């Protein structure tokens, strides 16, 4: 069923984050893993899979550790040919050339589209729709992560969603609607002067998927 919408004072306030917002920003500013039709080559711990994926652009990784919520998810995708799409990290990437991410995995077979599919993001500032823009995927089932990355990546460029020290926006959540059912993620870091990249991205480790045909995306921001 539907996840309920944010209650009063449920959302992280960016004014209560006193650290460097840079460390959030760099997760959505040109920082992503992407690969087509690959199969795991190894495994470190029981809830992860390792893929041979080369950073052709910047050469920052040859292997990617994809971390799941549980063993079942890893077992499921172990020997499957998959597509990978997600926001990765290096700082405190535990992997005994390398990088870490969570989820972002979909079966390749039976999930490709003849042509790219568009999903319109409706962006609200203090309730008002001032901006709309499409994200595209080639997948019938696509991870919320992939969509989330694409949305925030856009918004980091244009609207400066995140900056080195702090955001123009006090609160922000991204909402995914499929028919009646919906869910959302808080786009702002927990309060304090310590931002843990790995901890934040761990929300993607459920590998949550949506139908790219039915899903609508709404971004609700508030100003200062």
């Amino acid at each position: 069923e539907s996840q309920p919408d944010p209650k009063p004072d449920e959302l992280h306030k960016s004014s209560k984050f006193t650290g460097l917002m840079e460390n959030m920003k760099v997760l959505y500013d040109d920082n992503h893993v992407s690969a087509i039709n690959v199969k795991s080559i190894d495994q470190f711990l029981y809830f992860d899979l390792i893929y041979s994926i080369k950073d052709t652009k910047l050469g920052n990784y040859d292997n990617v550790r994809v971390e799941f919520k549980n063993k079942d998810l890893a077992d499921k995708y172990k020997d499957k040919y998959v597509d990978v799409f997600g926001a990765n990290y290096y700082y405190q990437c535990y992997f005994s050339r390398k990088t870490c991410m969570y989820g972002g995995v979909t079966e390749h077979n039976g999930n490709q589209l003849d042509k790219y599919r568009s999903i319109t993001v409706r962006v609200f500032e203090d309730g008002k729709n001032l901006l709309s823009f499409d994200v595209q995927t080639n997948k019938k089932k696509v991870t919320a992560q992939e969509l989330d990355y694409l949305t925030r990546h856009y918004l980091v460029k244009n609207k400066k969603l995140y900056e080195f020290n702090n955001s123009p926006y006090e609160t922000g959540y991204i909402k995914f609607i499929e028919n009646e059912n919906s869910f959302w993620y808080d786009m702002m870091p927990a309060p304090g002067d310590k931002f843990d990249q790995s901890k934040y991205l761990m929300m993607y480790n459920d590998n949550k998927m949506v139908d790219s045909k039915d899903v609508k995306i709404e971004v609700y921001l508030t100003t200062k």
């Epitope: 460097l20 460390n23 760099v26 500013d29 910047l58 050469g59 920052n60 290096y90 700082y91 080195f164």
Partner: nanobody
Amino acid sequence: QVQLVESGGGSVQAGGSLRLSCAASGYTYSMYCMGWFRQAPGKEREGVAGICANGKAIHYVDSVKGRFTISQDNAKNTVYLQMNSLKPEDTAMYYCAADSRGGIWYEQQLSTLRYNYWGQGTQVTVSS
């Protein structure tokens, strides 16, 4: 392929000054981090100064605070190290390093881990 070529190393005397320079080339994209490391014979390689995110994040090792200044010209794609009040302790091979990975890695920001690209270095000498 990335290339870092350091220069400006020399043989000075206690209380002297040197300005290191590094010419970066071969990528055509924007580098996130650029830094200066040093290593003497015997001792492990140590990070000295760093400058990240269009100069928004500058860090120094304690032993060079107030004496060394890292700086950047984006127009030239050069990084500099103004080395004032030099001491025998500062004698070493100085290396420029670079990195395209983002973030300010608390306490690991001047470690060798933070950087993937490296020059061949320039010798610095300081005589009592």
